[PDB]
Amino acid sequence: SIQTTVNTLSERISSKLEQEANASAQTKCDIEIGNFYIRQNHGCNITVKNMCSADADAQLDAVLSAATETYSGLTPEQKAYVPAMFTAALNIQTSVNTVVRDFENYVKQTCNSSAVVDNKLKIQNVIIDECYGAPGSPTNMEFINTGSSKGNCAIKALMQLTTKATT
Amino acid sequence: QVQLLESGGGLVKPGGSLRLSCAASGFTFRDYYMSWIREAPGKGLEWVASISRSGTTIYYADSVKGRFTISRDNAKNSLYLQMNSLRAEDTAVYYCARDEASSNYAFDYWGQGTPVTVSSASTKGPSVFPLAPSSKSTSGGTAALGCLVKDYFPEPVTVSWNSGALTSGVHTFPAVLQSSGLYSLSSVVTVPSSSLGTQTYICNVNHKPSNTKVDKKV
Amino acid sequence: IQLTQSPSSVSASVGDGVTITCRASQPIGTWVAWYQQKPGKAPKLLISGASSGTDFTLTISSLQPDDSATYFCQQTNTFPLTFGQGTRLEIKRTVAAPSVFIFPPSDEQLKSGTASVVCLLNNFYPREAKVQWKVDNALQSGNSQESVTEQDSKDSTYSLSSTLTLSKADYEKHKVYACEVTHQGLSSPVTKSFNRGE
C-alpha cells in the first residue's frame, strides 16, 4: 500500500544523494536531528537516518528528482490523491497537472529562504502533526538527514506530505 | 580560550576498566563533534571513538568496538570514554579533541593526554640517585649533573629541575625498560660551572601510579 | 579509507624543501587534513581541506629548526576516521660532536647491591653514534643500555645516555672504567675514564 510507495522513495532519496551528492551514512553532518516527535502518531515508526553531504543545492535537487521520479511511477488513479496531500500539509491548492512544479517552486523558494539557510542551530528538531497506521503493522517511514537545513527542509516538506496520506 | 583537560587514566590489569573524562572550556560544547584518539607508545596515531553534538549518532572503531563506550553531558561540558574489558593492545596515550563542526571537520584543538597502561604487573616506585656534578668533561667542561630514576613501573614519570625554574640544557631521555620488567631513566642538565656552589640543584621526580614524589639534591 | 603516507623519513636543511605524500586507496575527495606532533607533545594541526583523492601532497618550504616533528594525515569526513603512517622530519646541521661526560655510581646505589655508570653524549648531529664500554681496558657487553633524545628545537642536535648496570660485587672487583665514543664529528675516539675513588 502506502508503505510500498514510500520505501522506494526513501531508497531513491538515499541513492540520488549518494551519486548526485557523494554522500554516505559514514559522513559527517553540518546539522543533525535531535528529537523527532510526532504530535499524534498511531502506527508510524519513523526513524532518523543520517545520509549527510555538502552540496546543499544538490541535496535539494536530489530529493526533488527522487520525489518526481516516484510520482510518475504512480498509477493514474493513485496520483489523483496527491492534490489533497498538498492542501492538507501545505494548504497549496493544486491539481494533478500542476503538482510537480508547485512542489518544486515551494521547495526551491521556501527551502532557500534566509529563514532556513541561516539557522546556525546544528541540533534541529522535526515536528510532524499527524500520522496513522495499523496496529499489526504500522506504516514504516524515515527522515533522511541530508546534513543541511535547506535539504532537510525539503525532506520535512516531502515528509509532511506522506504522513498526510495515512488519513 | 579553549582547553580540553583529560582525566581518569592510569594503570589497570587486563579486563580492567577506566572512565576517561575530558573537561571542555572556552566554546559551545553543544556545537562540536567530540572525539577520542589514542597514540600507542612509540608508533601510531589511531582513532578510538567519536560522538555527535547530541550523542544520538555514535561511531566507534573495530578494535575497541563492543567494549568501549563514549558519552557526553553537555551541561557539565564533558566527554567520557568508558574503557571496559581492556587488553594489552590498548596501552596508549589517550587524547580528546573537538572536530571542527563550525569550521572544516578536523581536530583544531587536542588535549594534553592521559596515559593508560594495561598489564598484569604491579606498580613499583622509583629510586632516584644523583648523577653527581663530576668535573669530568670534554667539550666545554660546563658543569654536568643529573638524576637517575630507576626501577619503576609503569611509565611515565615527570622530572622537573629546580621545581620549574630550570629549563636550559635539561634533557629527559626516553626511559629504557631493563630486564627486570621495570624502567630506567636518566635526566641530566648542562649548567654553568661557576654556579655550582651558590645554586641548589634538585630534581623533582613524580610517579602518580605509585604516589612516589621524590626530590633529591645533586 | 587506508591512507599510505610516504616518505616515512625525510630530512632537509634550513631554507630548503621537503615533500610529504598521503596516497589513499579509495577516492576520499578533498577531505584531507595534515597534523604535526611535536616530539612528546599533543598533536597540532597545520593545514585542512573541504568542499578523486588517491594522491595528495604537502610541501613545507621555509624550513626552520622549529619544524622538526612528526607529521600525520587524516580522512576528515568519512568514518572510520583513519590517520596515516606518519612522517618524521629532521632539520640538518653542521656536523657537531658529542660532549662526553662520565658519571660514576652513587654511593646510594653502591649500598643497594647494583651499580650503574652513565656516559652522557650531549648535543651532537648526526644521530649515529657508537658508544663502546671498557672496564680495565676490556669490553663489557650485554649489560649496556642507551637512550637517545629527539631532535632539539633550537640546536638541531640529539643527546645520548648510555647506562652500564653492574653488580656491586663486579664494581668493587675493578677500578678503571672508561667510555669510548666514536662519532662522525670526531677525528679520534674520545675516551673518558674514571678510577674508583677520588
Q: In terms of topology, how is this protein built?
A:
The complex is a heterotrimer of chains A (167), B (218) and C (198).
Chain A (H helix, E strand, L loop, with lengths): L1 H18 L12 E6 L2 E3 L1 E7 L5 H17 L9 H8 L9 H12 L3 H4 L5 E5 L2 E3 L6 E7 L3 H14 L5
Parallel strand pairs in A: 1-4, 2-5, 3-6
Helix pairs in contact in A: 1-2, 2-4, 2-6, 3-6
Chain B lengths: L2 E5 L3 E2 L5 E8 L8 E6 L5 E7 L6 E3 L7 E6 L4 E6 L8 E7 L15 E5 L8 E5 L12 E9 L7 E2 L8 E3 L3 E2 L5 E8 L11 E4 L8 E4 L1
Parallel strand pairs in B: 2-10
Antiparallel strand pairs in B: 1-3, 3-8, 4-5, 4-9, 5-6, 7-8, 9-10, 11-12, 12-16, 13-17, 14-16, 15-16, 17-18
Chain C lengths: L2 E4 L2 E3 L6 E7 L7 E6 L6 E4 L9 E4 L9 E6 L11 E4 L8 E5 L3 H6 L1 E11 L5 E6 L8 E5 L9 E10 H5 L3 E7 L7 E6 L3
Parallel strand pairs in C: 2-8
Antiparallel strand pairs in C: 1-3, 3-6, 4-5, 4-7, 7-8, 9-10, 10-13, 11-14, 12-13, 14-15
Keywords (chain A): Disulfide bond, Host-virus interaction, Late protein, Lipoprotein, Membrane, Myristate, Transmembrane, Transmembrane helix, Viral attachment to host cell, Viral envelope protein, Viral penetration into host cytoplasm, Virion, Virus entry into host cell
Family (chain A): Belongs to the orthopoxvirus OPG095 family.
Subcellular location (chain A): Virion membrane
Any key phrases for this structure?
heterotrimer, A: 167 residues, alpha/beta, two-stranded parallel sheet, B: 218 residues, Immunoglobulin-like, five-stranded antiparallel sheet, 18 strands, host-virus interaction (chain A), disulfide bond (chain A), viral penetration into host cytoplasm (chain A), transmembrane helix (chain A)
Q: What is this entry, summarized?
A:
Chain A: This is Entry-fusion complex associated protein OPG095. The complex is a heterotrimer of chains A (167), B (218) and C (198). Chain A has 167 residues and is α/β, with parallel strands linked by helices.
